[PDB]
Write a protein that binds this DNA or RNA. Sequence first.
RNA 1: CCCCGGAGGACCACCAGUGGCGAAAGCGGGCGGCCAGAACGCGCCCGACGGUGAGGGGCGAAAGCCGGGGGAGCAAAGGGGAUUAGAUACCCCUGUAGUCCCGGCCGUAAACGAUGCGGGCUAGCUGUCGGUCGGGCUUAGGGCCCGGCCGGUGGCGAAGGGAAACC
RNA 2: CUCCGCGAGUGGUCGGGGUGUUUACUGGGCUUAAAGCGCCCGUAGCCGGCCCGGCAAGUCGCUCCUGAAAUCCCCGGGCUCAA
Lengths: 95, 129, 198, 149, 65, 194, 64
Amino acid sequence: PKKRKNRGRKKGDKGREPYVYCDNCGKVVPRSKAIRLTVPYSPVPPDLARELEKQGAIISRYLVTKTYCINCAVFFGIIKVRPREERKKRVPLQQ
Amino acid sequence: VMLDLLSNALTAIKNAEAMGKRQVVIWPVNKLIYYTLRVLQRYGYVGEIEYIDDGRGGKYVVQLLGKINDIGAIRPRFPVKYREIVEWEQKYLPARQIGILVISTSQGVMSHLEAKEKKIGGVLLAYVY
Amino acid sequence: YEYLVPLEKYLSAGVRLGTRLSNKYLEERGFIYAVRPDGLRIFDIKKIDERLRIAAKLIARYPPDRVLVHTTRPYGFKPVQMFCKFVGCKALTGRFIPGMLTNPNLSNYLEVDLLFVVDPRLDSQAVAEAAKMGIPVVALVDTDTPHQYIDFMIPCNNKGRKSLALIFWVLARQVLRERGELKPDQDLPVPPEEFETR
Amino acid sequence: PHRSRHKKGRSSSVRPPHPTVPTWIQYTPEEVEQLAVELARRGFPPSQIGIILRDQYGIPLVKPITGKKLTKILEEHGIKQELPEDLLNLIRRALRIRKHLEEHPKDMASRRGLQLVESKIHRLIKYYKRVGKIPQDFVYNPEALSHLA
Amino acid sequence: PQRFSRVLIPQPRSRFVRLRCPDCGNEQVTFSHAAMVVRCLVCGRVLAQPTGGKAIFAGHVVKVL
Amino acid sequence: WEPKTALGRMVKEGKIRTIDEIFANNLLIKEPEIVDILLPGLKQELLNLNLVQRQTHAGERNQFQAVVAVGNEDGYVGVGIGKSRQVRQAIEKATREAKLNITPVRRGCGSWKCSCDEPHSVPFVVSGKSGSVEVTLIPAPKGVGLVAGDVAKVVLRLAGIKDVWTKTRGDTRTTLNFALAVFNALRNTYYFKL
Amino acid sequence: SIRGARIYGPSPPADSTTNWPLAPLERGVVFACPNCGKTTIVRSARARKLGVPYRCPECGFVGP
RNA sequence: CCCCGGAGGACCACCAGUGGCGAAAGCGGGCGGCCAGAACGCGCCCGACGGUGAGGGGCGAAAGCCGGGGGAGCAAAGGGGAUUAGAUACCCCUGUAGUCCCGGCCGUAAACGAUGCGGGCUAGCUGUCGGUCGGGCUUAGGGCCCGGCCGGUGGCGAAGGGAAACC
RNA sequence: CUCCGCGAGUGGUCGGGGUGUUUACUGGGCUUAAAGCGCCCGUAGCCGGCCCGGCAAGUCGCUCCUGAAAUCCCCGGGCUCAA
Ligand SMILES: [Mg+2]
Ligand SMILES: [Mg+2]
Ligand SMILES: [Mg+2]
Ligand SMILES: [Mg+2]
Ligand SMILES: [Mg+2]
Ligand SMILES: [Mg+2]
Ligand SMILES: [Mg+2]
Ligand SMILES: [Mg+2]
Ligand SMILES: [Mg+2]
Ligand SMILES: [Mg+2]
Ligand SMILES: [Mg+2]
Ligand SMILES: [Mg+2]
Ligand SMILES: [Mg+2]
Ligand SMILES: [Mg+2]
Ligand SMILES: [Zn+2]
Ligand SMILES: [Zn+2]
Ligand SMILES: [Zn+2]
Ligand SMILES: [Zn+2]
């Protein structure tokens, strides 16, 4: 049976996708079907009491987006296996 | 590409009647559409047939009465002889007393009942019930 | 034209305010008046008042016990209580128990010949049993409401407290005048302010 | 393309149902015909001639005013086209592509566009031979028609 | 345009306008949706500019026919 | 019997005395006793009895699924299904929804080989479907008989139909669906816009 | 249409606006005109779902 | 590992989307030149010139073949280090065709929407792309918002259909 | 042992038809069960807008010459009924 009307990748009215490479992997997928979670990121986490407002310590915080496949995304808890009724509910992937 | 206007018009009535609509617009149109709708109105399957004048052939607006259980055009336009109309009668109609066929005979378009009284056959057009 | 209630009262309760959605059904029927440049839909208040009177005419032709006035929206809980406590319908605020009209073995198995709901898009279970059980339905529809199985509709703002209070005060008043206990110029003992919920 | 297009548009001009002469018109039927001949001798095609009449001179439609059509009007005053205007347009479109294909032999997208245009030519030649507007021996030779560019 | 099977009697949505050239003062009839540069017939300055829709008018609009 | 609901009251009180008034003003029967009061000459037949099993850890938990058709042979029929753990209960549940699902059927003539105006057959061509079985009921001349299958003859006979021709489709060996499709074709006769 | 055909059984309440028969087991709805209360309005279950409008034969009132 | 320079081949991150274009395959940096095909607006031209299409033809991923050029990264085959009962696999180091360009051949794919092409009719609600018209604002912009039409692209869902998933 | 079906018959293997809407004109199906060519240009074929006038080819009605006899259907009669 055709699970998912989407086919698993929101491709659109085209024939082919450019595809990317999976971090921690390389099994990967096209541009759709690839998880692209973004996390805030910053070196030296909560040392801002003893750093930053101590000496000068101009600290930086770089938004980083990470790309994964279905294997890695399920492996790192970014993706669960939802029930059938819950498959159609659009929830953000905790950033 | 639009090929047969009579089948297009007859299916519009079937579609609009099944939604319980009061009227239906028909376009494009020919004399065969009009002469068929006159036979329909003569048997109480159709209300008033108003005509509109555009540059593109013209339109008919037909008031439906909920009197149609099914309708459609017989394709292809089969020739039929007078002695054969009984056989075609039981093909498209339920019961011996219910429903009519629309025949295009040399004297004009008439119901299959009026063709049987005249003792002539012709080219089959449609069925109503 | 003569309004049932003075026009500054209607436009102070905002009854002519609809949701910013689209309703192709209502617009063709004529219950939509005009859309503002911010996209807000405004109803025709003349059609609102005319439909309130006919609603009172329809309700008055049934016994007061046999009419059920139910909403699950908590802004309409107080108005529907005060609507009928003056008319005596089986007011039901809260969960319409499924099976109330279709299960005769239920302890709350009511038998009603008319049903009145506030918002059919949220009071779907009430309307659902009406369609199955063949009971007429009235409702305060607006732009967001599905029109299925609604034999009489009143296009009005069924979301605000002031609109709900001012609509049930008018409707509660008018049904008494058609019923008889109030004069054509007589008014209710309470103003619309006591109908509104809190 | 001709078949399996992604989009099927509806763009067209909605003319009046029974067009009659405009009351504002300041042009007799003889003035309207003479205006078209001046444009024709200027070199505009019959499609573009009608646009100049409407846009510049405010003539809505030459047919109700004059009772004739633009090509029929131009035909009477000695303006005779080598081929019908639609056919000549398709032939010129093929030469401009076949000229392109010389220096770009690997333009596969342009080749299919040539094949669509060169099939539209063949349909019109089939029609025009049947009605007699072109000679029955006419053949689309792209090299023999280079003067039409 | 809309479907002909829906609209009863389709009519042109365009209109014909009469324009007076701001320079000379000739009155001219032109199409509202002009697909070309409309020039005043006498002095020749630009009266209408074509776009993808309604034309832009450089001359005053006396009355829309 | 206590007349719950109100339609049972008028049926018990004698305010409603004939079954036609239930069906001539669209009153939905909710209690089998209304049918028992108003159709005392009702016959019921066991159309089918299939054993359906549901698997579990300890093994299948069997049940009986009985199909019952009821009718007076005078244009009233009804088919109902019952699932129980014992066969006697399953038939009784079968008869209850059988009685609750009872419906009038329009009868008459209309065959080209007949001219009697009797209710022996179906008036016009009708069709009813259940799942994949599609059954067409065709009017027949008098004296032909029922030209259906065996289970179809039971439902047709209980509705007081004497002569009929049939044109079936799909798997008719699914007796629950063949019987239900035959029931629906009879009930579809009231959907004909006369 | 129908010519000398006898159809037996009860005749259900025909829809006032469509002639759709209020079939057994599919419950329609009957009431009087909301404005007058004189004429009787019959709405089959199909018309209620589709929102087919009705009109009073006596007064000009039209419903949903 | 860090800095100053040079050379080389491939790719075009974020923006970026069930976004766009294309008949399918397919197409993602900027500027330019030559072409193609559409959508919208139109009182422009012709006047049925149309649909489908056996046979016939053309285009057609990847791998692969023929001859030339090129060769950074990756990497069939192979070499080695491990693991293992075995390990001619999975991992690691390395590695040659190949991957890239040009001319030709092959003509296949889960070449898929597993859904042939053309046309008409049949509730609606909602996101978004292109054009256009009306109203309101303006980073006074080719800009933004509201509404209508036409044409695409997603979701939910009338009637209806289905063995059902579902359309 | 007893019972069942048919009976001067009753069985076995073949072949045809029904079975069988599993050949689908009436009257099937092709997302997933077998089944849409990877896509497109197009020849024959098939299918094709509206109105007016002419012909009457198809088509329809009547009649005639025919389509051997036998066979087939209906009606009457003769073998005792029957064949
Ligand atoms: Mg692909
Ligand atoms: Mg919106
Ligand atoms: Mg051809
Ligand atoms: Mg081929
Ligand atoms: Mg390759
Ligand atoms: Mg390596
Ligand atoms: Mg190498
Ligand atoms: Mg396929
Ligand atoms: Mg299927
Ligand atoms: Mg099959
Ligand atoms: Mg395909
Ligand atoms: Mg093949
Ligand atoms: Mg082709
Ligand atoms: Mg002849
Ligand atoms: Zn991965
Ligand atoms: Zn000037
Ligand atoms: Zn009979
Ligand atoms: Zn009335």
